Every structure is written in structure tokens, then in C-alpha cells.
Structure 1
């Protein structure tokens, strides 16, 4: 009664797997953020009469997001921390692990509940990505690849794009990405603020 849905990890990362610096993002990309918001918010039309997606994040990511933007609108937010607590929150879910979060969500958002869960996303940071990478239900990574070795002080924990991991993690066709996300997605390099980046989707068999 706990393992009824796959997890999807969503991340923007450099070719050196860098994801962060000074507890924030070391880039400023409005369209990249708009993609994150669209992907994490998208529910197919028939289902969206009551469906909401879930965003799971570590406490340091929670704090990283400008207070203006919290909780992340229109999604069920859960902050994962070893130390309960709160973080001061208006409706704001807390759990001590990825599986305690899932248990809390299934208990809270049941068959009878007016709000139902569509997809569940792990949205960072490195420590929670590490847990998700070890979780037997994670099967999908929505990666934005940033083609610049921007200096970072926190890194994605497993080199899923590299040869050593290439029998396990496979990059999907762009048409498959678009299908999964429910919309046209720009394909190939996008330039904002002096860097090229591009959207990818990678999967692992369960």
C-alpha cells in the first residue's frame, strides 16, 4: 500500500554535474525555470479535474527558493528533513525520508480525498537526489544540460549521462519527452544569458 507510483527526478546541471553554489543556482534562466514549472505542474486534461502533482525537496532547497515563491504554487510540496519541525509553513508538509513522504502522501491524498496525486517529482537537492537515485521506484530524470562548466560547490551524485551508467540510464527521443510532458518542447540548444542548454529525458527500467 505504498509503492503504486514511479518517481521522476527533475534537475538542471552542468556537463560537470554541477547543480548549485552558495545555496542557490549559479545561473539565472527564466525560460529554464518556466520549463521546470510547466513540467512539475502538467496533469493530463481528463485527470486534472482533481489531480495535483507533488514536489519533494530537501530542506536546503526549500530555503534556497526565494520566500516569494514558496510553497511552489499549484503543487503539493513536501520538505524532507531528519529533524521535525516545520520550516514555518502554511499547509506545509514535512517528512523524514523519501518513503515517509510517500506514506504521508498516500495517507493524506487517498481514494476518498478531494485532491488526488498525479505524478511525484524529486526536485533537489544533492542529498535528496542521492536518496532518489537509490530508490527502486525512480525511473526517470528530466535533465536540463547546461553546456558550461560553471563553478559550483554542490554536485549531482551519480554520473548518469556517462559511459559507466549507460546500460542502466538511456536518453529518450525528443518526441518521447514532448509526449511525456504533454507539450512541444524546444529541441536542441537554447541560449539565455551566454550559455547554451538543452532539455533531455533519461529513463531506467524498474
Structure 2
């Protein structure tokens, strides 16, 4: 009673797998953030009466979000921190691991709760991404590929777009991305402030 739902990782990364710098994002992509918000928030209409998605994040990531945007609005936020202490918070879930997170959510949001969980997202930390990539329930990566080798100092931990991982991870057709995401999504290269990026969806079999 815990390993029911699959997990989905969402991430914006460079062709060199760069995801962050001096604790922030090394780009300003207002439309990319907008896609992040849409994907992490989307719940099918019949279910949206009573269902919410969950965002799981590292502590370094909760801190890196501008204070004005936390908790990520309209999603159940859980911060994962090996050190369950005084950090605050208007109603804010803390777990010491990804699995302890799942147990807290299934305990807190059972049939018995007015709020029901739709999809569960891991939204980063390189270190949390690492745990997710090792988790037997992670089966989907929503990747925004940034076609510039922007200087980063934090990297996504597994080269999932590369030949060595290509029998495990497969990029899906764009219509399948749109099906999963529940709307039309810009297809192909988008340019916002200096460089091209594009939305991808990768899966693996559990």
C-alpha cells in the first residue's frame, strides 16, 4: 500500500545536462516556467473536482524558488530533507526521503480526505533527481532541452538522452506528450532570450 502510483520527473536541462548554477537557474524563460506550471498543475476535468497533483522537491530547490512563489500554488508541496526540524510554513509537508514522502501523502490523502492525489512530480534537486532515477516507480521524464552549453555547476545525474541509456529510456511522439499533458504544446524549437529550447517526453518500462 504505497507503490501504487508512478512518479514523473520534470526538468529543464542543457545538452550537457546542466540544470543549475550558483543556487538558481542559469536562464530566465518565462514561457518555460509557464509550461512547468501547466504540466505540474493539470488535472483532468472530471477528476479536478476533488484531485490535486503533488510536487516533490529538495530543500535546496524549495529555497531556490523566490519566496513569492512558495508553496508552489495549487499543488501539494513536499520538501524532502534528511533533517526534519524548524523550517516553517503555511501548511508545508516535510519528509526525510522520497519513500517517506509517498507514505506521508498516502497517509494524509486517503479516501477519508477531501483532497485526493492525481499525479506525483519530482521537480528537482540534482540530489532528489538522483533518488528518483533509482526509484522503481519513476517511469517518465518531462524534459525541456536547452540547446546551449550554458555554464552550470549542478548536473542532472543520469545521461538519459544518450546512447548508453537508449534501450531503457525512449523519447515519445509529440502527440503523446500532448495527450499526457492534456493540451497542445509547442512542437519543436522555441526561442526566448538567446537560445533555442524544446519540450520532450521520455519514458521507460517499469
Give the TM-score normalised by the residue count of structure 1.
0.99
Shift of 1:87: 2.2
Shift of 1:85: 1.6
Q: Hey, what's the Cα distance between the residues in 2 that align with 1:189 and 1:15?
A: 14
Question: Could you list the runs of 5+ residues in structure 1 that have no partner in the other structure?
Answer: none
Q: Hey, what's the Cα distance between the residues in 2 that align with 1:190 and 1:125?
A: 25
Runs (4+) of structure 1 exceeding 6 A deviation are: none
Q: Once the two structures are superposed, what CA deviation does each residue of 1:68-119 show, in whole Å capped at 9, x if it has no partner? A: 0000000000000000124211100000000000000000000111000000
Q: Hey, what's the Cα distance between the residues in 2 that align with 1:196 and 1:7?
A: 28
- Aligned residue for 2:71, secondary structure, equals coil
Q: 1:126–1:157: 8 Å Cα contact kept in structure 2?
A: yes
- Aligned residue for 2:119, secondary structure, equals strand
Q: Hey, what's the Cα distance between the residues in 1 that align with 2:195 and 2:88?
A: 36
Q: CA RMSD in A?
A: 0.5
Give the TM-score normalised by the residue count of structure 2.
0.99
- Which residue of 1 is the match for residue 127 of structure 2? 127
Shift of 1:46: 0.3
- Aligned residue for 2:124, secondary structure, equals coil
Question: Could you list the runs of 5+ residues in structure 2 that have no partner in the other structure?
Answer: none
What is the aligned residue count? Answer: 206
